[PDB]
Every structure is written in C-alpha cells, then in structure tokens.
Design a protein around this ligand. Structure first.
Ligand SMILES: Nc1ncnc2c1ncn2[C@@H]1O[C@H](COP(=O)(O)O)[C@@H](OP(=O)(O)O)[C@H]1O
Length: 322
C-alpha cells in the first residue's frame, strides 16, 4: 500500500540531510547542493527518486527546462501536437485542465503522485523535468529518447520566478526581497540553479547530438511561433501534412496553446487548482503576463547589467548568443 517513494523516503531524507545547505529564498526553506546545482529539499528527494526508479523508453519524449522559461507553454504545445487527431480545438482537454496535468514531471508527479492517471497509461509518451542534463536518470540518457529544451532571457526569467514565488501555498515563509533574491539568482543560489549552467549543459548535449535534442528559445517562439511549432511537430514524429497546413491546423494549435487562450480559461482563474493531485500553486499562477521585456518594470539598470554581463561572460563563443 506504500508507494515506492514512500518506502524509500526516510533513506532519501537521511541521505540529503548531510548535503551542504545554504540560506534559500524563504526563511524555513534552505537550498541543498547536489551535483553542482542547488535544490529545494522536496524537489531533491524527487530527483533522487527519479534517478533510482524512473525507466525511460526510446519512444518517450521529454520536455526539459529551467523553471519559468516556458514549461507550461511547451507542455500545452506538445500535448496538443501529439493528440490533435483526437480532439477538435473546441473540445480539447487543455480547455478544462491546466497543461501540467497532461505531461507529468519525472521528479514531482512520478515520485509524489504516482497514482495519477497519466502515469498509469503506457500509451503516454510525454514527460517533463527541470533536472539538469548531467543529473538525468541514466535510463533517460541510455534510451535515446528525444528531448526539447527551452530557455529564456535571464532578467525576464528571474522576474517570472520571483513574482511566481509570491503565489506558492507554503508554511515555509515569505520570499526574500527583490535585491536579496536577485543577488542569490546571480550567484546561482536558486532552485535547479545555476540557471546559466543549466542552459550550458543542455546546449553542449545538443551540440553533441543535434538529432536527439531540439533547442528552443522563449522570445524567438513568442515573436514567430509557427516555424518553431512545425519544427517541434516534425521532431516529435507528428509533423503537419500539406493538407493540415492549408486547412490552418498549425494556427489552430498555436491559438489553442497561446497565453491569451490559456490565461482566460475558467479552469485557470482565481484559486482554481489541478484536479488530478494536490498543487501548491493555483492554476492562475502559471499565467502572469506573458511578455518579453517585463524585467524593466522591476529591475534597476544596475541589476540588469550585472546579469547581462554574467550571461555574456558565460556564453561568449558558445553559440548561445549567436
Ligand atoms: N501559453 C503561453 N505562452 C507564452 N507564455 C506563457 C504561456 N503560458 C505561460 N506563459 C508564461 O511563461 C512563464 C512561466 O514559465 P513556466 O511555465 O516555465 O513556469 C510566465 O511568464 P511571465 O511570468 O513573464 O508572465 C507565464 O506567464
């Protein structure tokens, strides 16, 4: 009657209890270092579990991101693309439920909510994670399963994250202030951080096996979504036919999965939350503003310049700026 996670939880807690701990973004919530990256304690226990128990298949398809870079969007797009033969846009399930219900996290749903329907359906091939490339379950890497990675301009990412954290259901305390939070982010003391190292390891992975990994960028998709959605569909093995294109199927998929559509659904309003298992966020927390450039409403020019420089120092000559 205990799940596999529950049977192993005490040993996971013992294990991580001696990993280095640093002050985090809430007073009762330290960050814990594993594999050169920093973690929330729960998410680290999930990651350890995934590492020990998750069994990927070659036909699986993994959505990979650092948080707040476009994960919910990609979840909607991937689900919509793979299932479009089943559903008209007007009766698609993404109209009634938050996209996170359709694409389970290997470090959150797998360990903590293994009884969700999607995880019992061997017909499901869609999964997500924020686990850094270097720390992925050995099964994932060995299966050869295809991956899509998304990243985002770091100022907007930080602001997406800092605002979002105000909305968490938690008794571990309020989030640190803007300046302390940003300092921590810049030092790489963030969940799944350092952000810039997260990106670079997947980017290296891509360069080594560009057939296996599709690298996407929030701002690029946001400004010109059609080519990238077609690219994604093709990479998934669900490319759009000439017939679908001329009947405007691609636009229908883009519209369904758009910020404006998703934000304005009853399912995603107010305090409404997921129906499959307990969330610590309301669905609405996932849709804030959906813009490029919102950092300028929050960060000083001095803060902006610090992170821009950090990015240009880390990525110069990698191809990521170029
Ligand atoms: N369908 C969509 N299209 C574009 N952006 C979306 C989106 N759904 C959510 N977002 C935005 O993507 C960010 C969340 O990323 P994640 O899904 O990785 O947690 C938030 O950015 P903002 O906080 O800038 O509004 C959110 O509003």
């Amino acid at each position: 009657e205990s799940t596999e996670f529950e049977k192993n939880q005490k040993r996971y807690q013992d294990l991580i209890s001696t990993f280095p701990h640093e002050k985090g973004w809430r007073p009762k919530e330290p960050l814990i270092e594993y594999g050169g990256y920093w973690w929330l304690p729960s998410l680290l226990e999930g990651c350890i579990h995934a590492q020990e128990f998750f069994q990927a298949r070659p036909s699986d398809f993994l959505v990979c991101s650092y948080p707040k870079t476009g994960t919910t969007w990609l979840k909607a797009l991937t689900f919509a693309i793979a299932n479009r033969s089943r559903f008209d846009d007007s009766s698609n399930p993404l109209l009634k439920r938050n996209p996170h219900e359709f694409v389970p996290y290997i470090e959150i749903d797998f360990p903590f909510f293994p009884e969700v329907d999607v995880l019992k359906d061997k017909g499901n091939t869609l999964f997500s994670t924020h686990i850094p490339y270097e720390l992925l379950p050995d099964s994932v890497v060995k299966s050869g399963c295809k991956m899509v990675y998304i990243w985002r301009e770091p100022k907007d990412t930080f602001i997406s994250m800092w605002t979002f954290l105000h909305k968490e259901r938690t008794e571990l305390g309020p989030v640190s202030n803007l300046e302390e939070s940003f300092d921590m982010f810049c030092r790489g003391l963030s969940g799944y951080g350092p952000y810039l190292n997260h990106i670079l390891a997947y980017w290296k992975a891509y360069q080594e096996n560009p057939d296996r990994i599709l690298f996407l960028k929030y701002e690029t998709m946001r400004a010109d979504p059609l080519p990238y959605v077609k690219s994604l569909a093709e990479f998934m093995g669900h490319g759009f036919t000439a017939e679908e294109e001329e009947k405007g199927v691609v636009e229908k998929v883009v519209n369904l999965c758009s910020f404006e559509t998703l934000k304005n659904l009853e399912a995603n309003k107010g305090e409404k939350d997921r129906e499959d298992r307990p969330g610590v966020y309301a669905n609405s927390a996932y849709f804030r503003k959906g813009k490029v450039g919102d950092w300028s409403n929050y960060l000083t020019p001095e803060m902006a310049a610090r992170i821009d420089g950090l990015m240009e120092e880390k990525f110069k000559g990698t191809g990521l700026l170029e």
